Design an enzyme around this catalytic site. Sequence first.
Site: not given
Length: 704
Positions: A38, A428
């Site tokens: 992405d 993350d």
Amino acid sequence: VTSVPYKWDNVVIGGGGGFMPGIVFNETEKDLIYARADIGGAYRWDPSTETWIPLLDHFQMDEYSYYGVESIATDPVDPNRVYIVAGMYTNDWLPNMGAILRSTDRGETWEKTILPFKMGGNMPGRSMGERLAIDPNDNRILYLGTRCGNGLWRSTDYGVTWSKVESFPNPGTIIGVVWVVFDKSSSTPGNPTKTIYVGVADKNESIYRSTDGGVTWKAVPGQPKGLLPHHGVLASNGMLYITYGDGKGQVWKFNTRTGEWIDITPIPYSSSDNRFCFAGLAVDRQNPDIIMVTSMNAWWPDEYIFRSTDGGATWKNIWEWGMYPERILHYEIDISAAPWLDWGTEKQLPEINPKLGWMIGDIEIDPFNSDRMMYVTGATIYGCDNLTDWDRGGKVKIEVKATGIEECAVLDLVSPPEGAPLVSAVGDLVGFVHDDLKVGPKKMHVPSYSSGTGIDYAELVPNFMALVAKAVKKISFSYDGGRNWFQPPNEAPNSVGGGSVAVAADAKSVIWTPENASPAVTTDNGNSWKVCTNLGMGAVVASDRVNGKKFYAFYNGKFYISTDGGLTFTDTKAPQLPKSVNKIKAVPGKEGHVWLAAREGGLWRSTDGGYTFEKLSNVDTAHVVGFGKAAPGQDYMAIYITGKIDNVLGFFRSDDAGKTWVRINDDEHGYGAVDTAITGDPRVYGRVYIATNGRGIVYGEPAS
């Protein structure tokens, strides 16, 4: 500006680290696989090593948008050809129009066609696909599903030129047109495929068919309503399988030869157990009755992976409930290739780390091997090589299948003069101590954090570090170079933690500048905090590397010095400054040497604690600035920047305190957005570490 040859590579985090929304197998060549990211570009599988090779690293910072891979298609007629629809956002976060990328050497080299609209590689619904498809009878022809109401588009010259399919009825109401499936049996090789199915994100009418080679389109009669079609797969027996989500979910099969629709949802949609989309859809090419679907997202206790060997009539899940707390696993997970995947945390049942995953929007069965399967998660790619053991009552041996993928957004980097060569702060995954640049770390700093946003070490006490993060208290300290961390009782005033951090040269004070908050100092290791006088929101704070009493700050167009360890700051009244800065940094071993990375405002230096600055005339753009070991014979540390010199974009080194510059990257090594962190290595001359936004951590060294 001249160039010097460099050798570029990733510092290993291992196992990807982000969301890869799609995997695409070639229909005709065994072992030919691609994977799309992405924010993160695309990869081709190397079956000799079980690794992925990055394909789009030539894109420079002005074309970061093209790391957003909306769709990838691999030519079944000529497996040498591969196409990407590229473009990260459909809004104005980036200026680039969307592009179709075309390669005839499987993504070693690329041409592009710029489109009159944008893609959304990093937009909602990105795992729905594939939007881009190649006609398996006439590979001159490609179809493209688009976002934002642009509809269905087509090329008839191998993707060189593109036009809207005007006769297509419904562009969606905008996630848009999400997949194109050809029915190969409708024509013979050499002729345009006559029957084409198209999935559209519209709850009221989603499935469309042409039987005249894309001239006219009709909606398929009898189709379900209410949900969005994530994937469509036409099996060899004429069954079109489709997964649906909104949550709630359905799985359907449509008989293309008769017109009949059969509901094959593993868990009934009228059942209240149904509380998630079904998203991932795989059909075994060798047995059209073997199918698999995945949940997105059950979250608790884990996701569902359902398998059918009778065309959806009956399903088995990869786990079953037992004597609660307690679950029967028809699988193992091996994370030896990326051990951070268990988050260094043992869970209370029925939860188990490592998990099957989350955001499982895509699952694939190898069309040349019923035993091979892969699926995506928001953190990695998993897969197995003994899939059919499940059918005989054995365990699916799942392992990490993302080696070579480095998809992290890197937020900060330090290379301490003692200890590990690199310590990171990443999205993350929080960040890692990198004991060895080609060995993946076992565990992130603080498992309860989500993103590490800032990190610093005490220059004269390099085993002492501070890490700031989003998520528990959102600053952590270490006295052993990041091996072990602890949290204080209190935080600097903040809303979401995050932001940046500056550590005194002597480890006696730490300034936390949290996201959308003011700089605050602790001499307490976080027991108590004091807002730094004269500063505020958006201040860019850095510590002196020699003098633990000295800190620096750029704030609202002015430069500030602190000489009391960050308690109070004073406007230096510098006569000439940039209007704004991205980063500021002081030099190890040189007191009062402060550098300003002012993006388009250039690169500035002071040697007097920020009272006077000099803009270097030979630098156009400097997004970030960092330092490493001085070149042999030189009396200043090597300086590293990213930005622009003499109309060349890239990474640059100066071995003579900024008097001359050489380009250290090249046209094949861009790596996208490189404006978050850079550092040299104080112990290794010429080495540079660079934070990317979707290609993990890259490092370079002079080449032989």
